[PDB]
Design a binder for this molecule. Structure first.
Ligand SMILES: C[S@@+](CC[C@H](N)C(=O)[O-])C[C@H]1O[C@@H](n2cnc3c(N)ncnc32)[C@H](O)[C@@H]1O
Ligand SMILES: Cn1c(=O)c2c(ncn2C)n(C)c1=O
Ligand SMILES: [Cl-]
Ligand SMILES: [Zn+2]
Ligand SMILES: [Zn+2]
Lengths: 300, 115
């Protein structure tokens, strides 16, 4: 109803609490397309609505903030999603992006290769992934938890997401991973968010808000994905571009959230409380250094 | 010494009736900004569209060296404001035109420093 003026729809808590079996996703409005503002690309609209939704959460936004964006390339050879993130993020935010295939970017640095080749010395305050392989969408085959770049992402979050940081990871009916849902239980809060411009797709962004580095909650990811699909199957979402027309409050507010370096033994329940509120980031504040492993071959 | 003249090839291509480079990344914004040419966030006014800078740069888009001697790019990582009447060819626009060093507007599309 009133959802049409939101940037999208977040999975209601009651669906998260169910124990559904996985079914096929059947969307009422499947194949319908939203009318986008003149000249505006789908992925600009989609990222704008994601960022508009992220504004309503308790993101930590420190000075010297660091954001990494996987799956940032497009078949057009540009990076629309990166351009939206850099618009949204406070000026000066360090933004790194990456994709399997070459593209031109507004990011401060871009790594081209399989995400599994990417390494960073530093931790990050926000990780965004739009990684997706359309080959996963096989409606004739059983829909099992996928590995591939999802395996990388789970490990990358546990190793390089600062405590207090957040993630938004694109999934679909067939592009999903059970450990990633389980890891959502390691954040203070989580949801699956559907953009209103793409409401007729099984796509969602799995958002983890304020990382705690340990389980607040034990989540069975197979069941949780079945719960997500059940939600999608029983709650048609009206396609809407309405929120794209109000950009007055779009920029993410630079909260200057505190950054502290702390050892695991120093993280007490008062620290955890601050992390949970978007009021603390734990990491060092040294140089951001990245690399991509390159496989060398001589075919002569 | 030989160097490819990409700016000339594109200007010649356009005058020849070639179709302008597409998929320049247009941003959503209020269109109540300053109207300056190249900014760190979208600054289109009601007469302009804002675009991601990299996608409007001929050298970025064609995968060729920038004419800056250090290979710096003026647009990448910034946003470029394009007159709505020229927004069909942002790359041509940024190539052919010049930013006033004083006021930051496009010479002839916002710069009033000569009046
Ligand atoms: C839907 S698209 C990204 C669209 C882009 N975000 C935009 O803003 O327009 C999916 C991307 O995920 C990338 N990617 C997919 N699988 C990957 C993998 N194993 N490793 C690295 N990148 C991958 C694809 O090359 C592809 O560009
Ligand atoms: C989400 N979704 C659908 O909703 C759908 C479909 N085929 C029919 N419908 C309804 N496919 C392939 C699909 O992915
Ligand atoms: Cl730690
Ligand atoms: Zn350039
Ligand atoms: Zn001037």
């Amino acid at each position: 109803s009133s959802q049409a003026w939101q940037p999208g729809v977040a999975m209601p808590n009651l669906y998260k609490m169910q124990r559904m079996l996985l079914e096929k996703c059947d969307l009422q409005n499947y194949g319908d397309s939203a009318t986008l503002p003149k000249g505006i690309m789908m992925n600009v609209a989609k990222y704008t609505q994601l960022c508009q939704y992220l504004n309503t959460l308790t993101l930590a936004v420190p000075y010297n903030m660091r954001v990494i964006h996987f799956g940032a390339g497009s078949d057009k050879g540009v990076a629309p999603g990166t351009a939206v993130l850099r618009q949204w993020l406070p000026t000066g935010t360090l933004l790194v992006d990456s994709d399997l295939n070459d593209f031109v970017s507004d990011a401060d640095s871009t790594l081209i290769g399989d995400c599994a080749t990417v390494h960073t010395a530093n931790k990050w305050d926000l990780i965004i992934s739009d990684m997706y392989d359309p080959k996963t969408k096989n409606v004739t085959k059983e829909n099992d938890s996928k590995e591939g770049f999802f395996t990388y992402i789970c490990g990358f979050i546990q190793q390089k997401l600062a405590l207090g940081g957040s993630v938004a990871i694109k999934i679909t009916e067939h592009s999903w991973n059970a450990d990633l849902y389980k890891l959502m239980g390691h954040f203070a809060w989580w949801t699956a968010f559907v953009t209103n411009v793409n409401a007729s797709s099984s796509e969602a962004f799995l958002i983890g808000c304020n990382y705690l580095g340990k389980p607040r909650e034990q989540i069975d990811g197979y069941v949780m994905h079945a719960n997500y699909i059940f939600w999608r199957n029983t709650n048609p979402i009206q396609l809407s571009s309405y929120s794209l027309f109000d950009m007055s409050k779009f920029p993410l507010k630079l909260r200057g959230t505190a950054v502290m370096s702390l050892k695991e033994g120093q993280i007490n329940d008062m620290i955890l409380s601050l992390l949970s509120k978007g009021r603390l980031i734990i990491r060092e504040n040294n140089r951001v250094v990245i690399s991509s492993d390159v496989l060398v071959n001589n075919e002569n | 010494a030989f160097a490819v003249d990409a700016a000339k090839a594109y200007k010649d291509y356009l005058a020849s009736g070639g179709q302008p480079i597409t998929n320049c990344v247009k941003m959503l914004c209020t269109h109540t900004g300053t109207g300056q040419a190249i900014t760190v966030t979208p600054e289109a006014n009601m007469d302009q569209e804002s675009f991601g800078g990299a996608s409007c740069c001929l050298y970025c888009r064609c995968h060729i060296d920038h004419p800056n001697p250090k290979g710096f790019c003026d647009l990448k990582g910034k946003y470029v404001q394009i007159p709505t009447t020229c927004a069909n060819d942002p790359v041509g626009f940024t190539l052919k035109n010049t930013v006033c060093t004083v006021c930051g507007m496009w010479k002839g599309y916002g710069c009033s420093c000569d009046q």
